[PDB]
């Protein structure tokens, strides 16, 4: 110790500036802290978690406070399709006068920012109606944040910190989390939907003052007890419904309609109440599986042992995986990220097709800013899952306790996994690019029919299995004979089939040859991205070039020039190269979503369906064409609202281009440059009176990679995020 950092003595005595940089990056790595013990390791994590909940609640109290102090929330409700939602107010004392005018919009009095996070619609749907609901909404969350900060402190004192056995109780935790956390919360959210939300959308204002008088259903709390639940779906909202008033307002609370609300282009309220009620039950019943204290229920250790296939094809099967998971934090985190990485992509995919908030399918910019947002989050999280897979194989894996089980075998044929991933990537790469250049050339010479247009028929067959009639394949749910059709003709099909054939929504868009070629480009990304990460994980423990890689840790610079040079060998670097392919891959996904929708919203769907088969079509008709309004944010003639997005656009290009400087130019050059400089400063008069306390040295090899990637990612997000918002909001269509 003896100075910053307090948690690492080896860094403390480092005299150079390396200590300061490395005292920040290794703050949260609790294992490598000096004098750590397994009780501290958990107790810090538990306290740290409460710190992360404090931020989340404080963060959400910010949004409610500004939207209700500087926002259009009461006015926006009065006409959702013609009043720009307002995020907050602008007070920047560098603004000149024509900017102050330009950024005054949305019916405010000074400059403001238009909110594209779509909070305004979400709070409309879930029943909020004035400013005052929001203020108490702010206070409450602010209080919840205060409560969490107490807890993070409380569980560090003696007589309030859990022991080891408390955290390692994997059974009693899975009951509560499955039954209490996932379970009851979904049941209670159903309660709010049918006590406030649904009554709000029928003109009834129900609040904590009076929510005891009002009845969710005029015969409420009976029909459920008797067993004839067949009354809560009796008389739903009429087709001609106005979302905020009583016209056509039915009285059903739980339904199964499945279509869209005709006016607001969203899912029906009464479906969403039912669904959270349905999956409120599944988790409750799924919550009583494992044994805690009462002598019934499975033992997760036993289930793993029992599933050992006879014949030996899976060796000793899942034997011993209980302890290996239940003792390796980096294992548990890996699984959490993998599951969280998927559903976030799932959230992105479902929200834009089935708009769950009122008046959010016609705010085009909000759609794009949301779907693009969640995919990039999902791209990052999924990379972490493999990254903490590698740390598992290094720090916590044990090659004895996992003898021949399913886990050790994945280290036994690592050659077979790696090569085939290489094959599938190569096959997709050659031909997806191959057919593309061919399509490009054939159009360069003035012959568009000589392209290779492969009809994506399997996805068109599936769309025909869900009821889309454009392709006329006449299969299940698209053919009248099918029992599957008959099994649903009176429950949800009339609404679901009416939504799927409507040509305004994004539910099952028509796909053509363009969508075939892009999907493989997407598919190419996933394999190649996986290949780097999977190659990193399985070779973390060792390989032929260095069969004792485990003795150095997850992240080390290199192993020297010998044996032919070993640059970029740490499993860290495998994560490093991976991010580049993630950003490229997610680049190819969000690109595709934006252009397909931006042609749709204009009703010009032919433009995508032809230009999207040759690369110059993507460069001319999407990038070059749609950026005409963005780059004019400010010119020698004047400025516009779009100036801020024009500025950020270049700011994105600048950070990105600084990224190259750290990736290409490596350390040894700069270190020789500092030494001359640290000589000049030591001989200049009037400036040899000031002496560095910490000697100046160039960044370390790994730090430059991390720093270089930080710029590349930041510049790559800001650049696209500016173009995505400005181009769409410029036309608002």
């Amino acid at each position: 110790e003896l100075r910053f950092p307090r948690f690492s003595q080896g860094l403390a005595q480092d005299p150079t500036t390396r200590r300061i940089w490395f005292g920040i990056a290794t703050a949260h790595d609790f294992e490598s802290h000096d004098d750590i013990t397994e009780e501290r390791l958990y107790q810090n994590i538990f306290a740290s978690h409460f710190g992360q909940l404090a931020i989340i609640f404080l963060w959400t109290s910010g949004n409610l406070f500004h939207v209700a102090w500087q926002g259009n929330f009461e006015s926006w409700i009065q006409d959702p399709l013609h009043v720009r939602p307002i995020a907050h107010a602008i007070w920047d004392p560098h603004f000149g006068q024509p900017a102050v005018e330009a950024f005054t919009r949305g019916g405010a009095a000074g400059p403001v920012n238009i909110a594209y996070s779509g909070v305004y619609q979400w709070w409309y749907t879930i029943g909020l109606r004035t400013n005052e609901d929001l203020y108490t909404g702010a206070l409450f969350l602010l209080f919840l944040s205060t409560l969490s900060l107490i807890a993070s402190w409380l569980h560090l004192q003696p007589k309030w910190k859990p022991s080891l056995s408390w955290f390692k109780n994997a059974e009693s935790r899975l009951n509560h989390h499955l039954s209490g956390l996932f379970g009851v919360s979904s049941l209670a959210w159903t309660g709010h939907l049918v006590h406030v939300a649904i009554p709000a959308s029928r003109g009834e204002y129900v609040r904590w003052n009076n929510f005891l008088d009002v009845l969710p259903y005029p015969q409420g709390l009976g029909p459920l007890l008797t067993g004839q639940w067949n009354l809560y779906a009796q008389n739903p909202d009429s087709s001609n419904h106005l979302f905020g008033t009583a016209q056509g307002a039915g009285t059903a609370i739980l339904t199964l309609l499945g279509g869209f609300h005709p006016q607001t282009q969203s899912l029906w309220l009464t479906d969403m109440a039912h669904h959270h009620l349905a999956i409120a039950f599944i988790f409750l019943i799924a919550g009583h599986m494992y044994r805690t204290n009462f002598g019934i229920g499975h033992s997760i250790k036993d289930l793993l042992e029992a599933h050992t296939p006879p014949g030996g094809r899976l060796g000793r099967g899942h034997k011993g995986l209980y302890d290996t998971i239940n003792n390796s934090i980096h294992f548990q985190l890996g699984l959490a990220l993998a599951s969280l990485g998927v559903i976030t992509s799932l959230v992105a995919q479902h929200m834009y097709s089935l708009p769950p908030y009122a008046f959010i399918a016609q705010d085009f910019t909000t759609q794009a800013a949301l779907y693009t947002h969640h995919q990039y989050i999902a791209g990052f999280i999924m990379t972490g899952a493999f990254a903490h897979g590698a740390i598992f194989f290094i720090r916590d894996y044990n090659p004895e306790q996992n003898e021949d089980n399913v886990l050790a075998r994945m280290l036994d044929h690592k050659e077979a996994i790696i090569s085939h991933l290489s094959w599938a990537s190569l096959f997709l790469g050659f031909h997806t690019l191959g057919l593309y250049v061919h399509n490009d050339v054939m159009l360069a010479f003035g012959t568009p029919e000589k392209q290779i247009l492969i009809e994506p028929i399997f996805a068109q067959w599936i769309q025909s299995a869900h009821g889309k009639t454009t392709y006329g394949f006449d299969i299940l749910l698209s053919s009248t004979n099918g029992p599957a059709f008959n099994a649903g003709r009176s429950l949800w099909l009339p609404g679901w089939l009416n939504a799927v054939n409507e040509n305004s929504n994004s539910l099952f868009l028509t796909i053509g040859p363009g969508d075939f070629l892009v999907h493989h480009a997407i598919a190419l990304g996933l394999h190649t991205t996986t290949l780097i990460l999977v190659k990193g994980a399985l070779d973390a423990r060792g390989s032929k070039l260095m069969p004792d890689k485990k003795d150095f840790g997850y992240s080390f610079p290199c192993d020297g020039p010998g044996r032919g040079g070993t640059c970029d060998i740490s499993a860290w670097d495998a994560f490093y190269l991976a991010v580049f392919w993630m950003l490229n891959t997610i680049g190819w996904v969000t690109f595709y979503w934006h252009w397909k929708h931006i042609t749709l919203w204009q009703g010009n769907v032919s433009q995508f369906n032809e230009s999207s088969t040759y690369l110059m079509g993507w460069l001319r008709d999407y990038l070059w064409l749609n950026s005409s309004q963005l780059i004019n944010g400010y010119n020698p003639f004047g400025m516009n609202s779009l100036s801020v997005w024009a500025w950020m656009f270049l700011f994105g290009h600048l950070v990105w281009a600084t990224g190259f400087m750290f990736l290409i130019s490596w350390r040894g050059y700069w270190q020789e440059l500092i030494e001359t400089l640290a000589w000049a400063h030591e001989r200049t008069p009037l400036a040899n009176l000031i002496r560095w306390r910490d000697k100046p040295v160039a960044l370390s090899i790994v730090q430059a990679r991390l720093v270089g990637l930080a710029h590349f990612s930041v510049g790559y997000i800001f650049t696209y995020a500016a173009f995505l918002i400005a181009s769409t909001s410029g036309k608002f269509g």
Binding site: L2, R3, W91, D92, P93, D694
Partner: peptide, 30 residues
């Protein structure tokens, strides 16, 4: 009104005190 006070405080003062506070803590020695 209120922004004209809170914007400078979080933009100018609160950074300055923060940077000067850390600088002493980082550069301590015991």
């Amino acid at each position: 009104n209120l922004p004209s006070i809170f914007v400078p405080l979080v933009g100018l003062v609160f950074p300055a005190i923060a940077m000067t506070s850390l600088f002493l803590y980082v550069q301590k020695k015991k």
